[PDB]
Amino acid sequence: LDPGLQPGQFSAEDAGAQLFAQSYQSSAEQVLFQSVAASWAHDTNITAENARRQEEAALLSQEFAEAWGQKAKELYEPIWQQFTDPQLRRIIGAVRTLGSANLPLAKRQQYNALLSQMSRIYSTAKVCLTATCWSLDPDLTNILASSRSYAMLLFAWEGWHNAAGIPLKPLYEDFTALSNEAYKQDGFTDTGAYWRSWYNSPTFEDDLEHLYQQLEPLYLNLHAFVRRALHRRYGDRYINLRGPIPAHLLGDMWAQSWENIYDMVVPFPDKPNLDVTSTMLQQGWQATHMFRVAEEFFTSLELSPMPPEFWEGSMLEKPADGREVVCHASAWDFYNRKDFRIKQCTRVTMDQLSTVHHEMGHIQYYLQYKDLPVSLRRGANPGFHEAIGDVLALSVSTPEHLHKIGLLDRVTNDTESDINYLLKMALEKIAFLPFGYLVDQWRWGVFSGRTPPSRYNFDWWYLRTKYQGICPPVTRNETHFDAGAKFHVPNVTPYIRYFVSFVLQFQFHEALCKEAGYEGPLHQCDIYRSTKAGAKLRKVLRAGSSRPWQEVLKDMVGLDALDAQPLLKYFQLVTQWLQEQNQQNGEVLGWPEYQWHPPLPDNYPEG
Ligand SMILES: *[C@@H]1O[C@H](CO[C@@H]2O[C@@H](C)[C@@H](O)[C@@H](O)[C@@H]2O)[C@@H](O[C@@H]2O[C@H](CO)[C@@H](O[C@@H]3O[C@H](CO)[C@@H](O)[C@H](O)[C@@H]3O)[C@H](O)[C@H]2NC(C)=O)[C@H](O)[C@H]1NC(C)=O
Ligand SMILES: *[C@@H]1O[C@H](CO)[C@@H](O[C@@H]2O[C@H](CO)[C@@H](O)[C@H](O)[C@H]2NC(C)=O)[C@H](O)[C@H]1NC(C)=O
Ligand SMILES: *[C@@H]1O[C@H](CO[C@@H]2O[C@@H](C)[C@@H](O)[C@@H](O)[C@@H]2O)[C@@H](O)[C@H](O)[C@H]1NC(C)=O
Ligand SMILES: [Cl-]
Ligand SMILES: [Zn+2]
């Protein structure tokens, strides 16, 4: 480690800690910067040489983290939590958790290579037929969204899960062991315990479970209604009205968001078409327009535009020069207070317009907290960070807002139109809840050792069936590693943040709508051009992780905890309607034929 980046001496106390943090701050931006830059260079241009560079950057960050980490424990370990500066306790607390820097050098290098190899396998996996092969984004994504051929959907789903998952398994095993080894030396029972610790809530798992109990009935009713809609198309051979839904028929590779099957489930087809995808295509929207339209929503609230550096640096379309890139949409803080970028393989659809807003929310958080100490440039918790963009997208998706921006010609305010909208939103927001909840239940079990490698897939499918009421459309065994075919697993990104976000965003939406002086039904609120709403959101964004999330939440919404009531209020009309409709249709809620799997198509896969 360069002498300029090494820690000096400091008194064994608060006053020494404060100069220690400022000295860290000075060195850390360079170290954070070089790490992020090397990761950017790799993820926008996946090559062996860019991986080597990213690994060397990662070693340097570990060197840095070890030096500054061990210094913190030399001086403070027996006394550190009693500092009177709460921001400084947070800075120190982060600094003294070494993580992968606890590993001896040989194991660090092993750990870094595993992350690099897992990333490459996920983002370069292909399904081949012929010499021609399909990538996840856009080819397989488009098949899952637009094919209504059972066999074609099956080919794409099976191909992807087999291509990505199978080779990932042995690496994921080794990564899990090393990660646990690392975090155990910080005093955590396992890596999952460290990940949950970010919410600073001793009742976190019980609180999540209590939220899910309130939300599950909404999901079961949506599920049953959608299952009926699918049965009407695919027939009795491939849909069991008392069984789990085949996991490939819901519009999405992970069955995590169901908005692509909206045309099959829309209650009142004769009302205005609320999926504006076909209008975006007819009007010739491109990625550029989508990012500018999203930006202009943020500036309408008197939040910040995207700086020149964002526009010059960002990757907003998949490269047409054939390069391998990480297509999974992401938002980048380079930790130099100037460079902020999005990397998205943007496609021209309504849900991608929502995703643009999501990623731009991350960026806005970065812009607003850029002058805080680098350890406090985080969301109040990770769920806050995931919620910001989704909150704006809630306003954007309203038929009134879509009309304002030229995407929906007809205006209507009737009960049928409200049901259509709320159903469309339920396919996006309610359908996700079980998946948002289950992914880290799986991963927490892997980290704790409750789920060894011998049960990776068995336990994944247990949770997929238990929560989502889906089944794999072909047989799986423990050679398959279906968890690994979801980005966040091989890319080691925690998932419970998204469950938290999906509840939180309705709390935020309710609070901002009220601050805006809106007095109508919550699901028709649009905060566009509300400078008052913008000011309230800005307070949250400027806090970063400087204060406990419970206090930030309380200032924003009047409550110091996650609460499902705003979400339930938003959806109330369609919750009631789906319940009535399922009862009238004689549906079974749930999937009591839990063992059921669909048969193979007659000629699969030669067709
Ligand atoms: C779509 O239509 C709804 C329903 O409007 C109501 O019912 C219709 C059939 C007609 O009879 C309307 O005349 C009637 O308002 C609109 O929702 C309603 O919005 C109004 C105006 O913001 C709300 O009234 C306010 O209520 C608060 C107290 O909650 C008062 O302090 C205010 O002074 C004001 O009177 C009304 O509560 C609300 N009703 C419901 C059931 O939510 C909605 O605004 C409209 N949407 C659009 C986009 O036009
Ligand atoms: C993709 O990454 C490779 C490196 O792995 C880049 O190729 C290098 O380009 C730089 C100029 O920026 C030269 O100094 C090197 O001689 C090149 N190395 C090799 C091995 O060819 C390439 O420029 C990157 N592509 C893009 C579009 O940025
Ligand atoms: C796991 O499954 C692998 C391939 O899938 C199988 O092939 C299709 C045609 C059906 O037979 C389906 O039921 C199977 O899933 C096998 O190559 C492999 O032997 C199995 N793995 C182990 C460890 O036994
Ligand atoms: Cl998280
Ligand atoms: Zn995100």
XYZ file of C-alpha atoms and ligand atoms in Angstrom:
710
model
C 0.000 0.000 0.000
C 1.302 3.439 -1.023
C 2.670 5.437 1.992
C 0.224 8.296 1.296
C -2.685 5.817 1.721
C -1.353 4.258 4.975
C -2.695 5.272 8.397
C -0.532 7.328 10.761
C -0.909 7.712 14.498
C -3.903 8.888 16.379
C -4.777 9.115 20.011
C -6.720 6.219 21.438
C -9.987 8.238 21.716
C -12.916 10.146 20.094
C -10.775 13.188 19.183
C -8.172 10.874 17.564
C -10.983 8.947 15.829
C -12.238 12.189 14.217
C -8.817 13.033 12.707
C -8.553 9.272 11.858
C -11.820 9.438 9.849
C -10.802 12.678 8.038
C -7.417 11.146 7.209
C -9.264 7.989 5.996
C -11.676 10.138 3.973
C -8.747 11.689 2.095
C -7.216 8.332 1.115
C -10.491 6.380 0.669
C -11.871 8.365 -2.325
C -8.832 7.503 -4.398
C -9.092 3.841 -3.311
C -12.874 3.720 -3.784
C -12.430 5.602 -7.110
C -9.822 3.197 -8.569
C -11.938 0.204 -7.510
C -15.153 1.574 -9.056
C -13.285 2.682 -12.233
C -11.739 -0.760 -12.711
C -15.144 -2.370 -12.109
C -16.686 0.016 -14.698
C -14.012 -0.801 -17.243
C -14.684 -4.488 -16.671
C -18.519 -4.410 -16.630
C -18.791 -2.236 -19.805
C -16.151 -4.349 -21.622
C -15.735 -7.845 -20.156
C -12.219 -9.133 -20.960
C -9.580 -11.255 -19.215
C -7.321 -8.205 -18.958
C -10.054 -5.972 -17.509
C -10.786 -8.741 -14.944
C -7.107 -8.877 -13.924
C -7.154 -5.089 -13.500
C -10.344 -5.222 -11.434
C -8.814 -7.989 -9.255
C -5.696 -5.917 -8.638
C -7.911 -2.935 -7.720
C -9.818 -5.219 -5.346
C -6.531 -6.361 -3.693
C -5.532 -2.753 -3.203
C -8.913 -2.004 -1.529
C -8.337 -4.988 0.741
C -4.814 -3.764 1.567
C -6.300 -0.363 2.405
C -9.147 -1.954 4.394
C -6.722 -4.152 6.319
C -4.373 -1.279 7.219
C -7.117 1.112 8.393
C -9.161 -1.784 9.861
C -6.371 -3.173 12.079
C -5.460 0.350 13.248
C -9.084 0.878 14.464
C -8.944 -2.389 16.487
C -5.449 -1.730 17.891
C -6.631 1.577 19.443
C -10.378 1.048 20.079
C -11.672 -2.572 20.033
C -12.294 -2.760 23.809
C -14.027 0.734 23.947
C -15.238 2.014 20.495
C -19.081 2.069 20.587
C -19.327 4.747 23.301
C -18.336 7.751 21.109
C -20.674 10.691 21.495
C -20.532 11.612 17.755
C -23.083 9.247 16.165
C -21.850 9.919 12.596
C -18.306 9.152 13.753
C -19.465 5.877 15.409
C -21.013 4.964 12.016
C -17.777 5.854 10.160
C -15.625 3.918 12.636
C -18.050 0.995 12.685
C -17.769 0.540 8.928
C -13.942 1.005 8.956
C -13.338 -1.736 11.563
C -15.342 -4.414 9.663
C -12.592 -5.846 7.445
C -14.735 -8.428 5.630
C -12.771 -10.105 2.801
C -9.664 -8.196 4.020
C -9.543 -10.676 6.969
C -8.560 -13.403 4.502
C -4.871 -14.216 4.081
C -3.488 -13.002 0.713
C -3.851 -16.322 -1.109
C -7.513 -16.562 -0.034
C -8.202 -12.880 -0.959
C -6.903 -13.525 -4.427
C -9.052 -16.707 -4.567
C -12.082 -14.690 -3.366
C -11.528 -11.924 -5.920
C -11.097 -14.377 -8.799
C -14.297 -16.181 -7.781
C -16.320 -12.940 -7.894
C -14.789 -12.092 -11.298
C -15.460 -15.581 -12.734
C -19.034 -15.729 -11.379
C -19.758 -12.288 -12.906
C -18.334 -13.352 -16.292
C -20.278 -16.598 -16.345
C -23.580 -14.831 -15.590
C -23.147 -11.913 -18.010
C -21.670 -13.952 -20.939
C -23.868 -17.082 -20.758
C -25.718 -17.865 -24.000
C -28.468 -20.224 -25.143
C -27.560 -21.857 -28.492
C -30.020 -23.604 -30.850
C -27.071 -23.814 -35.786
C -24.225 -21.402 -34.922
C -26.686 -18.741 -33.633
C -27.009 -18.105 -29.872
C -29.214 -15.851 -27.750
C -28.069 -13.633 -24.879
C -30.233 -13.003 -21.799
C -30.642 -9.319 -22.639
C -32.252 -8.688 -25.101
C -33.058 -12.012 -26.801
C -34.235 -14.257 -23.950
C -35.887 -11.340 -22.137
C -37.941 -10.541 -25.244
C -38.935 -14.205 -25.686
C -40.080 -14.428 -22.048
C -42.006 -11.128 -22.463
C -43.667 -11.696 -25.901
C -43.763 -15.381 -26.856
C -47.006 -17.078 -25.876
C -45.712 -20.394 -27.259
C -45.349 -22.833 -24.346
C -42.475 -24.732 -26.041
C -40.537 -21.609 -27.012
C -40.873 -20.090 -23.518
C -39.751 -23.468 -22.155
C -36.687 -23.528 -24.439
C -35.623 -20.074 -23.299
C -36.296 -20.744 -19.569
C -34.546 -24.120 -19.532
C -31.672 -22.912 -21.691
C -30.959 -19.896 -19.511
C -31.205 -21.792 -16.189
C -28.946 -24.574 -17.512
C -26.410 -22.211 -19.162
C -25.946 -19.828 -16.241
C -26.649 -22.016 -13.192
C -24.779 -25.270 -13.827
C -21.224 -23.846 -14.162
C -21.807 -21.381 -11.308
C -22.416 -24.023 -8.642
C -18.855 -25.044 -7.758
C -17.701 -21.403 -7.650
C -20.666 -20.337 -5.518
C -19.793 -23.066 -2.981
C -16.221 -21.818 -2.675
C -17.313 -18.179 -2.497
C -19.768 -18.986 0.338
C -17.055 -20.684 2.423
C -14.569 -17.839 1.938
C -17.161 -15.130 2.616
C -18.158 -16.808 5.876
C -14.511 -17.325 6.838
C -13.937 -13.606 6.286
C -16.963 -12.287 8.196
C -16.612 -14.770 11.068
C -13.350 -12.973 11.982
C -15.421 -9.755 12.350
C -17.571 -11.577 15.001
C -20.586 -12.456 12.795
C -21.928 -16.034 12.865
C -22.011 -15.888 9.041
C -22.198 -13.499 6.095
C -26.020 -13.367 6.164
C -25.882 -12.135 9.761
C -23.592 -9.336 8.610
C -25.985 -8.431 5.732
C -29.023 -8.306 8.085
C -27.025 -6.122 10.545
C -27.299 -3.174 8.161
C -30.953 -2.669 9.217
C -29.970 -2.272 12.881
C -33.126 -3.984 14.033
C -32.968 -6.878 16.531
C -36.427 -8.053 15.370
C -35.722 -7.705 11.605
C -36.678 -11.242 10.518
C -39.866 -11.258 12.632
C -40.792 -7.759 11.406
C -40.389 -8.923 7.778
C -42.455 -12.020 8.446
C -45.250 -9.905 10.021
C -45.269 -7.667 6.902
C -45.452 -10.655 4.637
C -48.442 -12.134 6.599
C -50.403 -8.934 5.831
C -49.456 -8.970 2.133
C -49.829 -12.674 1.310
C -53.629 -12.619 0.798
C -53.212 -9.949 -1.905
C -50.667 -12.192 -3.606
C -52.791 -15.358 -3.351
C -55.725 -13.581 -4.987
C -53.609 -12.087 -7.760
C -52.036 -15.504 -8.314
C -55.402 -17.278 -8.609
C -56.833 -14.672 -11.028
C -53.702 -14.815 -13.191
C -53.638 -18.624 -13.118
C -57.221 -18.630 -14.482
C -56.188 -16.170 -17.242
C -53.313 -18.493 -18.181
C -55.536 -21.589 -18.063
C -57.884 -19.878 -20.602
C -54.933 -19.634 -23.068
C -52.698 -22.648 -22.402
C -55.387 -25.138 -21.382
C -55.751 -27.872 -18.794
C -52.630 -29.817 -19.846
C -50.180 -27.018 -18.962
C -52.107 -25.092 -16.239
C -53.417 -26.786 -13.087
C -56.101 -24.636 -11.446
C -55.241 -26.180 -8.056
C -51.469 -26.328 -8.606
C -48.392 -24.115 -8.983
C -48.022 -22.009 -12.149
C -45.244 -23.151 -14.503
C -42.367 -20.716 -13.821
C -41.879 -19.684 -17.467
C -45.384 -18.333 -18.250
C -45.464 -15.075 -16.286
C -43.627 -12.707 -18.649
C -40.271 -12.693 -16.935
C -37.284 -15.123 -16.648
C -37.708 -15.213 -12.815
C -41.524 -14.850 -12.712
C -40.702 -11.849 -10.493
C -42.792 -9.173 -12.215
C -45.884 -10.087 -14.218
C -46.531 -6.868 -16.177
C -45.825 -8.519 -19.615
C -48.909 -10.706 -19.413
C -51.112 -7.645 -18.755
C -52.928 -8.126 -22.082
C -54.131 -11.606 -20.976
C -55.340 -10.458 -17.575
C -56.640 -6.887 -18.127
C -60.194 -6.846 -16.590
C -61.782 -4.327 -19.010
C -60.009 -4.526 -22.449
C -62.302 -1.888 -24.035
C -60.905 0.921 -21.805
C -57.685 2.833 -22.706
C -54.633 0.587 -23.098
C -52.531 1.428 -20.003
C -49.450 -0.313 -21.276
C -47.931 2.432 -23.389
C -45.134 0.213 -24.814
C -46.764 0.078 -28.280
C -47.215 3.876 -28.248
C -43.528 4.400 -27.304
C -42.550 2.210 -30.280
C -45.060 3.949 -32.617
C -43.674 7.363 -31.488
C -40.011 6.265 -31.954
C -38.755 6.716 -28.380
C -35.141 5.688 -27.794
C -33.016 5.334 -24.631
C -31.982 9.003 -24.839
C -35.593 10.199 -24.659
C -36.352 7.873 -21.765
C -33.429 9.216 -19.656
C -34.291 12.841 -20.466
C -37.948 12.343 -19.581
C -36.913 10.724 -16.272
C -34.483 13.584 -15.592
C -37.149 16.182 -16.219
C -39.353 14.553 -13.534
C -36.514 15.027 -11.021
C -35.972 18.685 -12.051
C -39.764 19.290 -11.817
C -39.344 18.604 -8.083
C -36.333 20.962 -7.906
C -33.992 18.021 -7.501
C -30.761 17.949 -9.503
C -30.407 17.317 -13.225
C -27.901 14.713 -14.364
C -24.471 16.397 -14.669
C -22.435 16.458 -17.938
C -20.189 13.690 -16.582
C -23.263 11.374 -16.396
C -24.187 11.991 -20.030
C -20.585 11.693 -21.266
C -19.750 8.584 -19.189
C -22.918 6.471 -19.056
C -23.637 3.339 -21.079
C -27.337 3.740 -22.011
C -27.658 1.081 -24.749
C -26.085 -2.341 -25.251
C -22.928 -1.816 -27.425
C -23.494 -2.639 -31.106
C -19.753 -3.376 -31.547
C -20.459 -6.901 -30.146
C -18.574 -6.373 -26.807
C -19.501 -8.506 -23.812
C -20.992 -6.256 -21.102
C -22.914 -6.688 -17.846
C -26.419 -5.758 -19.083
C -28.065 -5.794 -15.636
C -29.081 -2.176 -15.063
C -26.973 -0.398 -12.425
C -26.129 3.045 -11.018
C -22.550 4.021 -10.188
C -21.015 6.341 -7.631
C -17.286 6.809 -8.403
C -16.720 8.414 -4.963
C -14.983 11.524 -6.425
C -18.119 13.736 -6.182
C -18.130 14.338 -9.990
C -18.546 11.049 -11.833
C -21.895 9.262 -11.599
C -23.123 6.877 -14.277
C -25.794 4.418 -15.285
C -25.026 1.232 -17.166
C -28.216 -0.164 -18.702
C -28.906 -2.147 -21.855
C -32.009 -0.062 -22.320
C -34.923 -1.345 -24.388
C -37.970 0.691 -25.431
C -40.748 -0.501 -23.167
C -42.890 0.962 -20.390
C -41.201 -1.228 -17.723
C -37.778 -0.082 -18.961
C -38.967 3.506 -18.520
C -39.758 2.522 -14.892
C -36.280 0.929 -14.623
C -34.677 4.142 -15.912
C -36.417 5.986 -13.069
C -35.250 3.357 -10.591
C -31.596 3.763 -11.624
C -31.921 7.555 -11.777
C -33.174 7.459 -8.166
C -29.875 5.838 -7.149
C -28.017 8.609 -9.002
C -30.062 11.362 -7.364
C -29.245 9.878 -3.924
C -25.503 10.081 -4.959
C -25.817 13.711 -6.091
C -27.530 14.815 -2.886
C -25.169 13.110 -0.401
C -21.886 13.672 -2.316
C -20.390 16.093 0.257
C -20.820 13.824 3.294
C -17.972 11.630 4.551
C -17.491 8.680 2.231
C -18.626 6.069 4.863
C -21.979 7.937 5.102
C -22.603 7.976 1.303
C -25.142 5.179 1.580
C -28.932 5.062 1.867
C -30.454 5.343 5.351
C -30.728 1.635 4.726
C -30.328 -0.292 1.449
C -34.120 -0.388 0.942
C -34.268 3.441 0.924
C -31.822 3.464 -1.956
C -33.934 1.016 -3.950
C -37.178 2.971 -3.215
C -36.310 6.482 -4.439
C -36.750 5.944 -8.199
C -39.706 3.579 -7.810
C -41.520 6.383 -5.906
C -41.247 8.755 -8.872
C -42.192 5.921 -11.234
C -45.446 5.481 -9.259
C -46.491 9.006 -10.271
C -45.172 8.583 -13.855
C -47.244 5.447 -14.495
C -50.592 7.111 -13.600
C -52.858 7.539 -16.667
C -53.055 11.276 -15.845
C -49.273 11.589 -15.963
C -48.927 9.440 -19.083
C -51.425 11.821 -20.749
C -49.284 14.857 -19.761
C -46.239 13.332 -21.526
C -48.049 12.274 -24.730
C -48.220 8.513 -24.058
C -51.956 8.128 -23.494
C -54.420 10.088 -25.604
C -57.689 9.189 -23.857
C -58.452 10.506 -20.379
C -60.896 8.424 -18.215
C -61.926 8.413 -14.489
C -64.235 5.443 -13.959
C -64.232 2.375 -11.707
C -63.295 0.047 -14.620
C -60.277 2.133 -15.548
C -59.146 2.236 -11.905
C -59.374 -1.565 -11.684
C -57.321 -1.891 -14.916
C -54.610 0.410 -13.570
C -54.485 -1.143 -10.110
C -54.319 -4.623 -11.671
C -51.455 -3.532 -13.887
C -49.643 -2.140 -10.809
C -50.402 -5.336 -8.807
C -48.724 -7.431 -11.565
C -45.594 -5.320 -11.040
C -45.647 -4.640 -7.293
C -47.718 -7.397 -5.602
C -46.415 -10.263 -7.775
C -42.829 -9.368 -6.795
C -43.391 -9.492 -3.010
C -42.928 -13.275 -2.564
C -39.784 -13.233 -4.707
C -38.373 -10.155 -2.981
C -38.864 -11.959 0.335
C -37.645 -15.459 -0.563
C -34.299 -14.829 -2.309
C -32.385 -13.934 0.877
C -34.279 -16.541 2.895
C -32.560 -18.971 0.499
C -29.248 -17.154 0.741
C -29.361 -16.717 4.527
C -29.871 -20.514 4.769
C -26.863 -21.107 2.533
C -24.666 -18.784 4.571
C -25.779 -20.297 7.916
C -25.134 -23.838 6.604
C -28.796 -24.861 6.920
C -28.696 -25.202 3.100
C -25.536 -27.091 2.096
C -24.543 -27.561 -1.596
C -26.374 -30.914 -1.571
C -29.697 -28.957 -1.136
C -29.096 -25.688 -3.092
C -31.786 -26.435 -5.672
C -34.122 -28.480 -3.437
C -34.315 -25.546 -0.983
C -34.544 -22.924 -3.756
C -37.552 -24.708 -5.261
C -39.049 -25.297 -1.813
C -39.088 -21.489 -1.290
C -40.155 -20.707 -4.883
C -43.138 -23.019 -4.485
C -43.936 -21.975 -0.877
C -43.971 -18.235 -1.617
C -44.580 -17.734 -5.331
C -46.689 -20.826 -6.117
C -44.628 -21.683 -9.156
C -42.953 -24.894 -10.336
C -40.112 -25.532 -12.779
C -41.500 -26.542 -16.191
C -38.821 -29.256 -16.594
C -37.366 -31.622 -13.999
C -34.422 -30.310 -11.936
C -31.873 -32.073 -9.717
C -28.832 -30.856 -7.693
C -26.649 -30.541 -10.789
C -28.857 -27.545 -11.553
C -28.284 -24.330 -9.592
C -31.334 -22.270 -10.464
C -30.593 -19.600 -7.803
C -27.378 -18.868 -9.747
C -29.398 -17.898 -12.871
C -30.581 -14.739 -11.091
C -28.125 -11.799 -11.360
C -27.887 -10.947 -7.697
C -26.639 -14.393 -6.604
C -23.389 -14.717 -8.663
C -22.959 -10.908 -8.383
C -23.221 -11.084 -4.598
C -25.836 -8.340 -4.281
C -28.241 -8.686 -1.314
C -31.970 -8.968 -2.126
C -34.033 -8.227 1.023
C -33.583 -4.514 0.148
C -36.183 -5.007 -2.624
C -38.854 -6.434 -0.309
C -38.128 -3.505 2.055
C -38.258 -1.075 -0.862
C -41.602 -2.371 -2.160
C -43.259 -1.667 1.222
C -41.332 1.551 1.871
C -42.103 3.121 -1.520
C -45.842 3.265 -0.750
C -45.069 4.910 2.614
C -42.950 7.474 0.762
C -45.594 7.935 -1.990
C -48.294 8.555 0.629
C -46.126 11.093 2.486
C -45.060 13.000 -0.653
C -48.613 13.080 -2.044
C -49.804 14.600 1.242
C -46.945 17.134 1.275
C -47.898 18.043 -2.322
C -51.427 18.963 -1.140
C -52.961 16.156 -3.161
C -56.332 15.119 -1.686
C -57.606 12.399 -4.064
C -57.289 8.601 -4.090
C -53.658 7.625 -3.416
C -53.286 5.569 -6.604
C -54.177 8.669 -8.715
C -51.591 10.958 -7.052
C -48.968 12.513 -9.320
C -46.245 14.521 -7.504
C -44.908 15.997 -10.813
C -43.926 19.660 -10.360
C -44.470 19.555 -6.567
C -41.527 21.550 -5.228
C -42.823 20.908 -1.660
C -42.729 17.124 -2.253
C -39.251 17.535 -3.752
C -38.008 19.385 -0.643
C -39.303 16.600 1.622
C -37.662 13.906 -0.532
C -34.402 16.000 -0.640
C -34.129 15.908 3.180
C -34.073 12.106 3.054
C -31.560 12.055 0.192
C -29.138 14.541 1.838
C -29.057 12.527 5.124
C -27.339 9.517 3.548
C -26.595 7.000 6.353
C -25.700 9.790 8.787
C -28.732 9.088 11.031
C -30.657 5.925 11.991
C -33.114 4.970 9.247
C -35.985 4.801 11.769
C -35.521 8.538 12.564
C -35.188 9.511 8.901
C -38.382 7.541 8.149
C -40.191 9.196 11.089
C -39.288 12.679 9.836
C -40.509 11.790 6.351
C -43.716 9.822 6.952
C -44.591 10.209 10.678
C -43.788 6.580 11.565
C -40.473 5.037 12.642
C -41.095 1.571 11.155
C -41.937 -0.247 7.986
C -45.702 -0.444 7.603
C -47.808 -2.265 4.974
C -50.850 0.027 5.418
C -49.940 2.569 2.672
C -49.464 -0.249 0.140
C -52.777 -1.819 1.252
C -54.566 1.536 0.968
C -53.151 2.089 -2.514
C -54.385 -1.282 -3.768
C -57.657 -1.502 -1.734
C -60.065 -1.307 -4.695
C -58.368 -4.105 -6.657
C -57.726 -6.212 -3.542
C -61.516 -6.121 -3.000
C -62.302 -6.734 -6.673
C -59.924 -9.719 -7.073
C -61.297 -11.293 -3.887
C -64.865 -10.895 -5.228
C -63.902 -12.173 -8.695
C -62.055 -15.279 -7.443
C -64.990 -16.175 -5.137
C -67.417 -15.700 -8.040
C -65.248 -17.885 -10.311
C -64.965 -20.646 -7.616
C -61.159 -20.445 -7.494
C -59.001 -22.263 -4.967
C -56.631 -19.770 -3.362
C -53.151 -21.362 -3.222
C -51.744 -24.497 -4.846
C -52.697 -27.572 -2.767
C -51.467 -29.859 -5.570
C -47.935 -28.825 -4.537
C -46.265 -31.789 -6.252
C -47.717 -30.941 -9.668
C -45.386 -30.287 -12.607
C -46.480 -29.804 -16.234
C -45.682 -32.450 -18.857
C -43.145 -31.802 -21.624
C -44.502 -30.676 -25.012
C -44.902 -33.656 -27.385
C -41.945 -32.954 -29.669
C -39.771 -30.905 -27.269
C -37.033 -29.852 -27.896
C -36.666 -30.783 -31.653
C -39.410 -28.220 -32.480
C -61.603 10.646 -10.081
O -62.845 10.679 -9.406
C -62.692 10.558 -7.992
C -64.073 10.415 -7.372
O -64.704 11.710 -7.359
C -65.915 11.689 -6.572
O -66.887 10.767 -7.083
C -67.291 11.048 -8.430
C -68.184 9.918 -8.927
C -67.978 12.412 -8.454
O -69.149 12.364 -7.627
C -67.027 13.485 -7.924
O -67.715 14.735 -7.853
C -66.499 13.100 -6.537
O -65.499 14.034 -6.086
C -61.909 11.746 -7.421
O -61.698 11.482 -6.031
C -62.162 12.520 -5.162
O -61.373 13.695 -5.302
C -61.922 14.802 -4.578
C -61.167 16.080 -4.933
O -59.782 15.952 -4.602
C -61.895 14.478 -3.083
O -62.537 15.544 -2.372
C -61.718 16.154 -1.347
O -61.853 15.474 -0.094
C -61.122 16.076 0.983
C -61.243 15.207 2.237
O -60.769 13.882 1.963
C -61.640 17.496 1.198
O -60.972 18.135 2.287
C -61.417 18.311 -0.071
O -61.893 19.654 0.091
C -62.113 17.630 -1.244
O -63.533 17.747 -1.096
C -62.625 13.174 -2.785
O -62.389 12.796 -1.424
C -62.154 12.053 -3.708
N -63.006 10.884 -3.538
C -62.561 9.625 -3.392
C -63.616 8.567 -3.237
O -61.384 9.316 -3.375
C -60.574 11.873 -8.137
O -59.941 13.109 -7.811
C -60.756 11.834 -9.641
N -59.457 11.717 -10.267
C -59.078 12.420 -11.328
C -57.687 12.115 -11.814
O -59.795 13.247 -11.866
C -11.917 -3.062 -23.935
O -10.830 -3.404 -23.073
C -9.583 -3.651 -23.716
C -8.587 -4.025 -22.618
O -8.858 -5.347 -22.122
C -9.139 -2.400 -24.483
O -8.006 -2.710 -25.324
C -6.899 -1.851 -24.980
O -7.131 -0.507 -25.408
C -6.207 0.420 -24.838
C -6.638 1.829 -25.247
O -7.714 2.282 -24.408
C -4.776 0.083 -25.287
O -3.844 0.810 -24.467
C -4.438 -1.419 -25.224
O -3.359 -1.686 -26.130
C -5.599 -2.356 -25.585
N -5.337 -3.712 -25.109
C -5.602 -4.823 -25.814
C -5.255 -6.120 -25.143
O -6.090 -4.819 -26.933
C -10.246 -1.799 -25.346
O -9.869 -0.464 -25.699
C -11.583 -1.734 -24.610
N -12.635 -1.369 -25.546
C -13.363 -0.258 -25.426
C -14.403 -0.041 -26.484
O -13.204 0.539 -24.519
C -29.654 -34.127 -13.602
O -30.338 -33.981 -14.838
C -29.425 -34.012 -15.970
C -30.106 -33.664 -17.302
O -31.512 -33.402 -17.164
C -32.267 -34.620 -17.319
O -32.548 -34.831 -18.721
C -33.894 -34.681 -19.189
C -34.020 -35.148 -20.639
C -34.821 -35.455 -18.263
O -34.349 -36.799 -18.084
C -34.849 -34.735 -16.922
O -35.710 -35.450 -16.030
C -33.445 -34.617 -16.316
O -33.366 -33.444 -15.488
C -28.742 -35.384 -16.061
O -27.736 -35.411 -17.101
C -28.056 -35.766 -14.754
O -27.769 -37.164 -14.807
C -28.846 -35.431 -13.476
N -27.887 -35.228 -12.391
C -27.541 -36.125 -11.485
C -26.539 -35.672 -10.470
O -27.980 -37.246 -11.455
Cl -29.908 -5.367 1.815
Zn -31.525 -0.587 -7.644
